[PDB]
Design a protein around this ligand. Structure first.
Ligand code: HEM
Ligand code: HEM
Ligand code: HEM
Ligand SMILES: [Fe+3]
Ligand SMILES: [Fe+3]
Ligand SMILES: [Fe+3]
Ligand SMILES: [Fe+3]
Ligand SMILES: [Fe+3]
Ligand SMILES: [Fe+3]
Ligand SMILES: [Fe+3]
Ligand SMILES: [Fe+3]
Ligand SMILES: [Fe+3]
Ligand SMILES: [Fe+3]
Ligand SMILES: [Fe+3]
Ligand SMILES: [Fe+3]
Ligand SMILES: [Fe+3]
Ligand SMILES: [Fe+3]
Ligand SMILES: [Fe+3]
Ligand SMILES: [Fe+3]
Ligand SMILES: [Fe+3]
Ligand SMILES: [Fe+3]
Ligand SMILES: [Fe+3]
Ligand SMILES: [Fe+3]
Ligand SMILES: [Fe+3]
Ligand SMILES: [Fe+3]
Lengths: 159, 159, 159, 159, 159, 159, 159, 159, 159, 159, 159
């Protein structure tokens, strides 16, 4: 069905945001695993897979609206080299995603593309849940210190 | 609860749209069965039953808002006499439904009737899924030709 | 995440509305049980627990937006002393809740806080379902009289 | 059955005390969840639900004794801004509940209302168990320091 | 163990009160069955069996305290000739049982026989639950009229 | 085994009584169903089948005693045209059956045919149970009025 | 159904007999338990519950015959203070019950009330089974002496 | 319990009748098996075991009534030497049993020993069922001839 | 929570009383096993374990009230050298425990420590059940002689 | 079987050692629970129950050897008031138990009482396992500090 | 492995002891069965089978140590002709076995054959368990008399 070109543009900007989140969370999952925080690594793997679903939803909507999904590039990655830097890096990216979806939802509503508006509003609520999670971890690092926070999430050793 | 009269009017126009879709999909299901495309007939039966649910949701909302649901008339039916004409007939009807729900949702939002707005936005997304399906079938008829497309969906013979 | 102060205010006004509904439905459940209408008492218990979930959703959102949830006060209770007065008391409260959520949803939409808007629109639809229920009971009391209506819902005696 | 008016006043004071504890524990559950202490949040949610049952027990006894349960107001809430302050706030409240139920039980015994006396004595023992739990948490904070105590109860990360 | 003689006299008075309630409720169960109110008959059969357990509890305590249980006589029965009269007859009896157990409990406490005090307080609470049930049935008769109340509890016809 | 001729006569008079009861209850079952009292209709069907068993027991005994069972005629039917007339019609027939079996049992005892006496005494007790049922329904119609009595037994609507 | 007045009198005399047996067996069950003969106590509990069923059958028949069941008084109790006196006390009561039922059955037969006759003949056979049991226990006490007889039935100690 | 001496005499005459039936049916079972009519032999074994139960019931009643059961002698056996003679022999014995029980039941009723009367009336009905069976077999031999009747009941050959 | 010092002294006296009962019953269990009365040994083992739970209840309450539980000493043990002496020794001890808990409960009530009062009243009732058991065993020894009583409880031989 | 008197003395000294260990571990279990170290409390409860088994084994052996078990007194308790003092207190007691059993085993071996020797050698090995446990906990407190050690064993909060 | 000759001698003396115990317990099992004490017979059968295992353990060890097991002769049997003589006979034999194993264990320890020492110490402990059993039975015969002791163990009659 031919879609509004500017909505398609916002969907492709959202696709690039999600592809950045997928790789930034996956690399941070494998860095947390390499550092030995196996329970933090488990959660970051699961968050990267949640963003993979979001990327797919954008690809599907762009094709339905007869646009061309662009998966060639990502937004710049932010790679942390301590557990606190990983939390901070992912929080900054997720704030930028939320603001993009707020703008995409308002734009789509202004042209009557309510199903696209509802996809951006659904993803904006999911990114505020990711933000809540990341802010909470940084709250614990502030109140307990980074070493008590991270030690709690080392996890179990493999068989 | 007494509703906005113009919202009730949009809900009754949507009810008439859905009653037309129910009968137009059911007659096309039974025409596809009569022609021998039993897998296409199965899908059209299921789409007619999805529109029956949509009609019921409009009847329920109109009564809650103390209006009088009107099931006496349908919009003009479009009856195809080849498989491609059936696809084209149902696509034209479903585009008209989507545009009605886009307008009903915007109107209800402008008067603060957010539950009615959300019913129209939910049905608008479901009709874009029906549109996607119908456009895809016409894409296959364009790329393969009608006879290869239809032959694939003849289905199994009855016991 | 720091939220819009006026949205936080609407969420706290909604929290007070729900805390009033929880206690007003719970007291009416126990009054209906004391009067012997055990099937009406069962339904009012379940409605009070639905409003407990709504109160919790407001507390969670206010904290996420870094506000301070205020559970200290309720709106004035309306306590019925006949079954019809209980129906009327709860209907008047639920109409006031619906109108508050309609205004909170419109305000949050105007500042781009779409997840808060969607929480108010979800609760507004749930309160219209509660309104529908309460209006229907008062319709039956109007058409049958209070004693036939209430006698039907006396229920079973305890073992 | 018409009850002693002063016993009904103690039962209503108890109802206010429990309504305060329900909301103080629930807000503290959601604050501990917001801060990331998910095992402390689980336990405060369960203690709030224990106080909801106590509130219900008072509403039921007041109606049986033909009084009017008053759910309009709470005692002043004490909201803590650190985990230690939440423990201290709830301990102060629960000490005041215990002393009220000690007095309610003695009064009801002095007028022969032994079923009400036994409700106040049952709830006094329950509040001493709550007091023992909160004193134990403060004892751990005193011996280990707040950060070690609170880190132990961060809990597991959500799927 | 040799008991206080006056506590054994209160226990025997209680035994007579329960034997009266067993027979008054059983005759009323069979009268309600004879009249055709099979759901009211089921409930009075179960209340009679509850009073049989109370009678047994008194026989057991009297023998442990080395007294002689007296089952020879009952208090005067009150037999109702309409459903409302059966409710009133059993309410009057149960008010007299409650007042006896209030006095038995106070006496036994004053001589330190706390296990007997606790048997009388347990049975006083049970009789207040019976009193609450019978007051509730009379409340329904007052609000709906006897015929609507009794018709609801006719029950099902036997296979 | 050749039986007493006069006992055989009483057994054949009892067979005619039962054949009348079978058809009078079956026709009243189908009249109650036609009028919409489906729970009364269920009970009357079951009572007609109980009388079918009684008819068969008479046929079996008459043949054992080498008599000729006569199923050609019935006693005059009493057909009610309101629910109260159906109750009254069946009560009058069942009183006549009971009196016949009382006389048959006394006659058979006077000639030493104790197995026939015991068949009449067993059926006389079963007809007093049917009488008890019918008297109870007429008691409820007297105390509640016919419309409250019958409305309670309308039953459930068919799928 | 209006019954023979003198049959009703015999049924009420039988009801008083059974109410005496219920309480005399229950008190002897609890005396045997208090003395430590737990297997004798089990059997006496079960015999008291058999007499409770017999009392109920008299109440049901008296109401069917439109009489007034009288549960106000018992025949004089016979309370044993050794195991042999308990056996002797219950045997004397049960002989008096059997003779009453023999007379009630003969009277009811003389007026044609065969269902009442059969209730008295059924209870007379059950009381001869109780007599057989009690005579057998006294036979064992005669042949073995009371202490060997009673020691065998001390039973098992409670967990 | 000391019984009526003449009732005891009738019970002992009935015991002798049953002991004769047990042995006469058992010998005929084994003669029918020896002749090869295995289905007739099965039925005669089962009838002999039914008479064993009847003999035991007489022994039990005689002892309860403090008489001395006499199992020393039987009534003269009638031994058939063809299948028809076996049927005829057992029919003549069973007619004599039925007449004895008719007289025993009338005698016991005349002295008020209703439980003994009911044992004789129960056995008289069971012997009329045995008579019915035996008369039916002789009816088939009369209508089909002995060889067709007996051939049908040869049965299956043993593994 | 800081407790009343004199209530803590009664709780410690109770703890000493229970520690004495645990060891007196356990030594008596092993003496009855040594003598071969295996069913009496099973029951004394279980009563000792009941007193272990009572001891624990006192240690828990004393620590909650911030006292120091004293397990260093026992009251003087009474060791029996025959089965009758073991019964008498344990009865004397349990009478002293019961009187202590009667006094502890009255004292705690007089200072408003109702949870401690209720622990002493619960244990007073439990010790009256122990007293009833031991009095019953002595009653059997008095009526049957010690050898018949003890032989019944020798029990089964081990595999 | 009459045992060596000095072996019996060593068994009674061992019984006193175990009774001291039972109460010292049980009081420390309840102190650790009161302080909030629920996983340490679980382990100390289990160790106290292991010592209860050891006490019982001494009672059984002393009775077999015809001695008199003495449970009247304990060795002086050592009560810790920090987690490290509890570990130290129990280690000092368990070293004294091990040395007693080493001496008892050598003595019993010198008089040929090999089953008693093997009971002391079995308990000496079990007390070295308890020593190993306690030394390991004190090793962790030395290497990590008391607060890290104890925080790890706080455990889970109760439902 | 070639063993110490004197250890082999002690093992063969122990084998002869066990073969004597096997046959002496088996003959006493069958004498107790013949006299009718079926529960004593069951226990003696099981004890004979325990000694069969002990005999086998000696045969196995003697062969491992390259000796020649000698099963040709037994020690003199002691055959009781009353239940008390059977108990006394088996106790005297088992005391002699225990003393032999005490000496065998000390001898084997003196030559370093610790596995043989441990076999003798294991059997010495098992024979002290058999001694305990037998002494206990003789204790019961002393306190109750032989006839009360033996009557308790007559057991159940065979199907
Ligand atoms: C802050 C105000 C309250 C909040 C946020 C709240 C929240 C909740 C929630 C979320 C549940 C369901 C718990 C679950 O299923 O896991 C619940 C249960 C319950 N609440 Fe409340 N509640 C509140 C006030 C009350 C009041 C005022 C009463 C009665 C006076 C009450 C009585 C109950 C009872 C009895 C249940 C358990 C119901 C059952 O298990 O069937 N609640 N509440
Ligand atoms: C009117 C006099 C009484 C009547 C008609 C009566 C009737 C009954 C019936 C029919 C049951 C069996 C209920 C069932 O299984 O559904 C029963 C149970 C019982 N009755 Fe009575 N009863 C009477 C007096 C008593 C007395 C005087 C006592 C004791 C003082 C007693 C104690 C019990 C107990 C304890 C049971 C339940 C037994 C169990 O569940 O194991 N009853 N009674
Ligand atoms: C004579 C001193 C004692 C002896 C011989 C003893 C013996 C025993 C034995 C053998 C058991 C396990 C029972 C079974 O599993 O069948 C046990 C259980 C128990 N004991 Fe003791 N005990 C003694 C003192 C104590 C003391 C002083 C306390 C507490 C103050 C105590 C508290 C318990 C509890 C609570 C259990 C049951 C534990 C459970 O079921 O989880 N015991 N005792
Ligand atoms: Fe995303
Ligand atoms: Fe995200
Ligand atoms: Fe649709
Ligand atoms: Fe559609
Ligand atoms: Fe709500
Ligand atoms: Fe609501
Ligand atoms: Fe509370
Ligand atoms: Fe609390
Ligand atoms: Fe009661
Ligand atoms: Fe009651
Ligand atoms: Fe019939
Ligand atoms: Fe009938
Ligand atoms: Fe009876
Ligand atoms: Fe009886
Ligand atoms: Fe027979
Ligand atoms: Fe027969
Ligand atoms: Fe205790
Ligand atoms: Fe005790
Ligand atoms: Fe130990
Ligand atoms: Fe240890
Ligand atoms: Fe051996
Ligand atoms: Fe042995």
């Amino acid at each position: 069905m031919k879609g509004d070109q500017k909505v398609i543009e916002y969907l492709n900007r959202g696709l690039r945001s999600e592809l950045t989140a997928v790789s930034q969370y996956w690399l941070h999952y494998r860095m947390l695993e390499d550092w030995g925080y196996k329970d933090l690594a488990k959660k970051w793997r699961a968050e990267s897979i949640e963003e993979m679903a979001h990327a797919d939803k954008f690809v599907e909507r762009i094709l339905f609206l007869e646009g061309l999904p662009n998966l060639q590039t990502l937004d710049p990655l932010r790679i942390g080299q301590t557990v606190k830097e990983v939390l901070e890096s992912d929080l900054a990216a997720e704030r930028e995603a939320r603001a993009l979806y707020q703008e995409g939802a308002a734009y789509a509503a202004s042209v009557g593309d309510f199903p696209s508006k509802n996809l951006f509003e659904e993803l904006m609520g999911d990114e505020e849940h990711h933000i809540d999670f990341l802010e909470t971890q940084l709250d614990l690092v502030s109140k307990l210190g980074l070493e008590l926070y991270a030690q709690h999430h080392i996890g179990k050793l493999d068989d």
